[PDB]
Amino acid sequence: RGEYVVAKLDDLINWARRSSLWPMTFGLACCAVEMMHMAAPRYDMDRFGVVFRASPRQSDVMIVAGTLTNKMAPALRKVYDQMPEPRYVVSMGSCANGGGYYHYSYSVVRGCDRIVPVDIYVPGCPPTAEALLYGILQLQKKIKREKRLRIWYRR
Amino acid sequence: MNLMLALLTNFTLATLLVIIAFWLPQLNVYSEKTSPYECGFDPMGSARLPFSMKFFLVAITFLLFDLEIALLLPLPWASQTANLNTMLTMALFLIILLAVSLAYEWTQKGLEWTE
Amino acid sequence: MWFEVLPGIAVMGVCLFIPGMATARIHRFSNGGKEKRVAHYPYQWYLMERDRRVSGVNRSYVSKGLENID
Amino acid sequence: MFMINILMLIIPILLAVAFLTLVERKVLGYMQLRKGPNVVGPYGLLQPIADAIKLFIKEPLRPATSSASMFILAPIMALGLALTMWIPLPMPYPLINMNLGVLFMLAMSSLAVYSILWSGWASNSKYALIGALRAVAQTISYEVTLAIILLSVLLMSGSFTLSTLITTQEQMWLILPAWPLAMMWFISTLAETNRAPFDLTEGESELVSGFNVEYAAGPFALFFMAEYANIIMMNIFTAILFLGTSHNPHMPELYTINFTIKSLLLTMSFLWIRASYPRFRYDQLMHLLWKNFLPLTLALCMWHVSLPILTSGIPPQT
Amino acid sequence: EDNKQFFGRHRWVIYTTEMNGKNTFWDVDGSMVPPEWHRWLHCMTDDPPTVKPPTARKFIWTNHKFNLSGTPQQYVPYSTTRKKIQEWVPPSTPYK
Amino acid sequence: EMVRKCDPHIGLLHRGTEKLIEYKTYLQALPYFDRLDYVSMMCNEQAYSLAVEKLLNIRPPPRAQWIRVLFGEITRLLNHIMAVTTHALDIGAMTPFFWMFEEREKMFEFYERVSGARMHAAYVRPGGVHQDLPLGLMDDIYEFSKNFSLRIDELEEMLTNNRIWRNRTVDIGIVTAEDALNYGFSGVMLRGSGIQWDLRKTQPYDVYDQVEFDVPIGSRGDCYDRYLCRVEEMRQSIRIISQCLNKMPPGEIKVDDAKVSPPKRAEMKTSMESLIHHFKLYTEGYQVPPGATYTAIEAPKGEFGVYLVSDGSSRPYRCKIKAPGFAHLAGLDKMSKGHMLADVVAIIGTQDIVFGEVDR
Amino acid sequence: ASATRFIQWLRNWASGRDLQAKLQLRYQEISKRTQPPPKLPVGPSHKLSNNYYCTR
Amino acid sequence: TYKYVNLREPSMDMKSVTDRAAQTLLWTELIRGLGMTLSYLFREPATINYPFEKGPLSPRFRGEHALRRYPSGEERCIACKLCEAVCPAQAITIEAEPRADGSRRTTRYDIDMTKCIYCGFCQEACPVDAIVEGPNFEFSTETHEELLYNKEKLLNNGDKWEAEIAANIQADYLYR
Ligand SMILES: COC1=C(OC)C(=O)C(C/C=C(\C)CC/C=C(/C)CC/C=C(/C)CC/C=C(/C)CC/C=C(/C)CC/C=C(/C)CC/C=C(/C)CC/C=C(/C)CC/C=C(\C)CCC=C(C)C)=C(C)C1=O
Ligand SMILES: CCCCCCCCCCCCCCCCCC(=O)OC[C@H](COP(=O)(O)OCCN)OC(=O)CCCCCCCCCCCCCCCCC
Ligand code: SF4
Ligand code: SF4
Ligand code: SF4
């Protein structure tokens, strides 16, 4: 049957994408320190297949770790745009979620979701290294439930 | 025949992998996605502008020394001759002059990159 | 622990072993169970092209001993 | 049966490269007090398979400012030439038995540089350009030293045939008579493979990603595959040059096992080194090989021309 | 538990393969640990719930629910205050 | 690749902290200071607390002053681990980052066990600290400190005598002692050029005059001498931590003046005066007498101070923050003269820049 | 702490230190996660007499 | 007191010059760097097996917010608004009115979890231990709106984590 085959192919590409997530080397503020500790030996994000790469053209995930200011917002959109698809965005911390401590500032963007689409919101100020890792494993489950090929098969 | 078939297979496999890369995935091309990368901000000028080479003198010297390997590589065969006294003399003379060239450029600050 | 790195080296080692083993066994199969004749110089190539003619089957790896002289 | 021989070479090479990426991440992990890939498959054995699929089903983009024909020619050239440097390697029998195999590998290693220069230039990006011109400086640095280091060793072997290096080291490894040359050779393979502490063409912390900053998806994978196939090859070359293995014509597999172990250990040393040292400045790499290795290599080249003559130990021509 | 393991690796949970009707053989989640065991697993205390159970309250959830984001059971914010200004309703009978 | 001009553009992390502080009470403004130099959180809090206490004309109790010094020097380990290893990470040496960030993780638990937050404790406040150390913490700090010296030795084995590391750092970014003073440098940026200055010894605060430690001094003024100074300062911080673990006195941990520090919750639920002061100290805050102060501390990255202005109300009128990295980064153009691109990567790391404080 | 005697010798030799004496992984030498309750002291101003606020 | 870090004069006797010559030519101090990373390869890694193992925390940990009840089920919060006044981020919005039984209670208790800085000032200022920061930290969401907690969401959090919340307050209230 054709539905069975596309279901298995969907499970294969979904598996490959969630097992080889490559975050862009992109951090803005204090929240990036907690992102470093997720790469530190205790949590070792690399063991899940999550490897940082600096070039936006070799990244699959953007983690907006810190405050997004009006000056930096055009830069963020540019690097997000230069990510080949499929691309997912993870918003880390109060600043990147909705402005946080600086919601009412003349120079702060009230949430990175005004600039880019966001797939997972990680709360905290900063989220602990173990709370960011929960969001990454929650993103992987989200990718595991994608139905790209099944939706194509019945178009 | 074998060497040519080995080369065709290596570059055919390389080509087929590239073809799959461009035709298998789902593409969503738009202007901002394909703009040049300069860390997030638009590049200030063209990447085709002149790029000063501070080791230009050492690069010219590489052309002259890279020709010494052509003259030195026949030495394993040269050692098979019956004129060993002459062969060993000219082998050492040729290498020594290659060394004097290095000494001259080194002492005259030729290997130092320009400011 | 560190010995959990070994499984990745064993797989890598098996992959590096195959090219050498396959060439060694494929040469035996293509030359009648002998090493492939090495001909770096014309004299060796001259003897290999003489082996073809002597074999009578257009193969240089088919040897003919004293049974072929009388 | 020759086409089967070719496939029995490139396909295992691509599998060894795939799992060398796993082995490097786990070896770097444990030298950094962590584990590395252990989730995707048992002990991370499926991590390379997940990465290959991910990269080849991802969107590749041609930059708007790129030169398309050269931009796409470069990755093809890189992988096509990284697989071509294995055909003369005796393991113990070469796929292609060349009388000048050492020269052939030199020529191919100089042609593979242009997969960097054309990749970086065609991308029409400033970081790709800075990366490309660092490959020009790097090649200017090691090329002269590398060729004369090979020549010194070949004066004890007597030929440019790779299979002859097996006969030369039948009684003893060449590491003993040529340990000074083995040290410089090892460093020159690090520079020639763009490996840390000489990873300057990419230079992640300086050029983001260097010559391949604009490459994505499959085209990037080809550069990565070429990079890792070269380090294995340059260590197989080193094992043959300085750590010769005994060849029993009735047990050609024993050679392969022993020869494979040494190549793995030399390859592990590349990963061991990448975890231990900082990065040279690329002008400091030029001075390392022109002011230290070249004076020594020239002296050792004279020494190895004279030593066989004055001891009556000139090797046979054939 | 294994007190010979170094601190951090000396306590662990092997998650159930089914919880609240969800198949969790492969899809385990950190939020599946009930609160009483959440304190022991994170080393906020030395005593497990089996040796020192939590105080019983009739309003405490008897059934623990994991993170429900992305499902129909997710939480949807809304204002919990009533309307503030009451609009005038015209008479339903013509004046004429 | 030769650098002809450096033009740092900052403000990509400018959030208006100084303007936002003017709308907060002195207590509400404290968590802003953990987020300026977000690697030296409890040192930023102390500088703010010393300024408000100076304007309040009150004095934190002796036990609070020892906790603040103790966690002031644990914080210096956090900052110097971040500074040295990232500086080495940008230069190509990545292994030390992982070794020492397993030591930062353990020092984050000390933060988490006194405040509840791994980084932004908000623990040090005007009047003392917020809560007493939980039982058994000092034993855990002793165990961590007993081994940390070996961790630094492993760090030095990889870097100090390495010739590749010395090539990247010796004679790179030389700054003269005269230029450093005029450009506004402070901390290791002065001490690396041979200037004998350290506010912990010349203008002591809290109980720094009751501890013994040596100030490292450079000789060349380059990136290698500033690396040695930072590694040697980590050793001296362990030396101070030993003295703070043994001289820790008993007593209360916040000033016993309930118009400045809130009362204990047990007293807040039993006493009328304590409930009134708890109510006012958390709605209006404490009024600070009018006046302006400039108060500075030897923060891990240099001289960190605040020019705090009060108008007599509970909200600050002006709060100017002196980030040491603001002056250092301003000098990146002078220190980069005659160097290549890869050297500017080394100069940035030697200045120990965090843009939470530079941009504020 | 579970390393065999041989591996302990190898790692001590390769670094030049006695690593076992100072292990960077924590073990049962840490404090108990459950502690007895405290009884914290009071400040100098907790007095019933001679404690008027205008004098402090 | 100060000390010099890099003020040393090397020895010039022939044995010391030869020792430095051997270091330059034989890479002794680089081989020593290799030996330090080899030692780490044979140590046990510090990685924990998350989510099957969790990093240690303490009773003071400041996680997700929750509204507590008295043991009888009555809400502790009496709409004093001290948390709203002290919240540095203004993440708390409160409305209140006399309840049907005349009790001072809230009709709106919202926390914008994207404005909040998880500082704990609210639980410090609460005179009835009503608003607390719980021990939960694994509550990431797939949409922004799910992080705008209202009173119903906060009471559900309190009823969910009360067993753990009460034990943590029991372990730390004498330090408060
Ligand atoms: C404190 O102040 C501050 C800073 O200061 C430090 C800051 O910076 C920032 C800014 C912050 C950031 C930009 C983010 C910082 C976060 C970090 C985690 C950095 C901290 C330090 C690290 C050391 C983290 C990781 C970096 C390194 C160098 C670790 C080394 C380990 C690795 C695994 C990296 C890569 C290594 C290897 C060996 C290669 C793995 C790579 C791959 C791409 C996978 C394999 C590749 C493939 C192509 C697939 C394989 C198979 C193929 C190709 C197919 C073959 C088979 C076939 C069949 C074809 C802020 C805000 C700040 O406030
Ligand atoms: C004893 C070990 C033998 C085995 C070693 C084999 C390796 C040889 C390569 C290393 C060089 C060592 C050999 C050189 C002689 C060493 C012994 C020696 O010099 O005598 C000891 C004597 C004591 O030294 P001292 O008085 O304290 O101070 C020096 C004052 N001139 O010093 C003196 O005062 C005598 C005068 C010293 C100056 C002589 C010139 C020495 C430098 C020339 C280069 C030597 C290296 C040349 C070879 C390079 C290749 C390795
Ligand atoms: S959310 Fe908190 S930790 Fe993250 S950048 Fe904002 S203030 Fe810093
Ligand atoms: S934790 Fe702090 S920021 Fe968050 S709601 Fe409470 S007082 Fe406001
Ligand atoms: S939660 Fe506490 S502080 Fe906030 S309004 Fe209710 S009773 Fe007052």
Curated annotation (Swiss-Prot), chain A:
Modified residue annotations for Hydroxyarginine: R53
Q: What is its EC number?
A: 7.1.1.2
Task: Detail which positions bind [4Fe-4S] cluster.
Answer: C30, C31, C95, C125
Q: List GO terms (cellular component aspect).
A: mitochondrial inner membrane; respiratory chain complex I
Alphabetical UniProt keywords: 4Fe-4S, Electron transport, Hydroxylation, Iron, Iron-sulfur, Membrane, Metal-binding, Mitochondrion, Mitochondrion inner membrane, NAD, Oxidoreductase, Respiratory chain, Transit peptide, Translocase, Transport, Ubiquinone
Q: Which cofactor does it need?
A: [4Fe-4S] cluster
A biological process (GO) of this protein is: mitochondrial respiratory chain complex I assembly
> What coarse category fits the chief subcellular location reported for this protein?
mitochondrion
Specify the domain of life of the species encoding this protein. Eukaryota
Query: How the protein assembles, per its UniProt entry?
Result: Core subunit of respiratory chain NADH dehydrogenase (Complex I) which is composed of 45 different subunits. This is a component of the iron-sulfur (IP) fragment of the enzyme.
What family is this? Belongs to the complex I 20 kDa subunit family.
Task performed by this protein? Core subunit of the mitochondrial membrane respiratory chain NADH dehydrogenase (Complex I) which catalyzes electron transfer from NADH through the respiratory chain, using ubiquinone as an electron acceptor. Essential for the catalytic activity of complex I.
The name this protein carries in UniProt is NADH dehydrogenase [ubiquinone] iron-sulfur protein 7, mitochondrial
Highest lineage ranks of the organism?
Eukaryota, Metazoa, Chordata, Craniata, Vertebrata
Curated annotation (Swiss-Prot), chain E:
Tell me yes or no: is Nucleotide-binding among this UniProt entry's keywords.
Answer: no
Describe its function. Accessory subunit of the mitochondrial membrane respiratory chain NADH dehydrogenase (Complex I), that is believed not to be involved in catalysis. Complex I functions in the transfer of electrons from NADH to the respiratory chain. The immediate electron acceptor for the enzyme is believed to be ubiquinone.
Q: GO CC terms on record? A: mitochondrial inner membrane; mitochondrion; respiratory chain complex I
Name of the featured protein: NADH dehydrogenase [ubiquinone] 1 alpha subcomplex subunit 12
**Keywords linked to the UniProt accession:** Acetylation, Electron transport, Membrane, Mitochondrion, Mitochondrion inner membrane, Respiratory chain, Transport
Regarding protein family, the annotation reads: Belongs to the complex I NDUFA12 subunit family.
The main location class comes to mitochondrion
Membrane topology category:
Peripheral membrane protein
Indicate whether Membrane appears among the record's keywords: yes
Its quaternary organisation is: Complex I is composed of 45 different subunits.
Question: Where does it live in the cell?
Answer: Mitochondrion inner membrane
From Swiss-Prot, chain G:
Q: Which cysteines are joined by disulfide bonds?
A: none
Q: Name where it's found.
A: Mitochondrion inner membrane
- Tell me, how does this one assemble? Complex I is composed of 45 different subunits.
Q: What does this protein do?
A: Accessory subunit of the mitochondrial membrane respiratory chain NADH dehydrogenase (Complex I), that is believed not to be involved in catalysis. Complex I functions in the transfer of electrons from NADH to the respiratory chain. The immediate electron acceptor for the enzyme is believed to be ubiquinone.
Q: Which residues carry this modification: N-acetylalanine?
A: A1
Family to which the UniProt record says this protein belongs: Belongs to the complex I NDUFA7 subunit family.
**Ranges where the record places region Disordered:** 31-51
In Swiss-Prot or TrEMBL terms, this protein is called: NADH dehydrogenase [ubiquinone] 1 alpha subcomplex subunit 7
Question: Which residues are recorded with the post-translational modification N6-acetyllysine?
Answer: K39
UniProtKB/Swiss-Prot annotation, chain H:
Topology with regard to the membrane? Peripheral membrane protein
* Entry keyword annotation includes Iron: yes
Give the Enzyme Commission number: 7.1.1.2
Q: Which cofactor does it need?
A: [4Fe-4S] cluster
**UniProt record similarity statement:** Belongs to the complex I 23 kDa subunit family.
The UniProt subunit note reads as follows: Core subunit of respiratory chain NADH dehydrogenase (Complex I) which is composed of 45 different subunits. This is a component of the iron-sulfur (IP) fragment of the enzyme. Interacts with RAB5IF.
Q: What is this protein called?
A: NADH dehydrogenase [ubiquinone] iron-sulfur protein 8, mitochondrial
Gene encoding this chain? NDUFS8
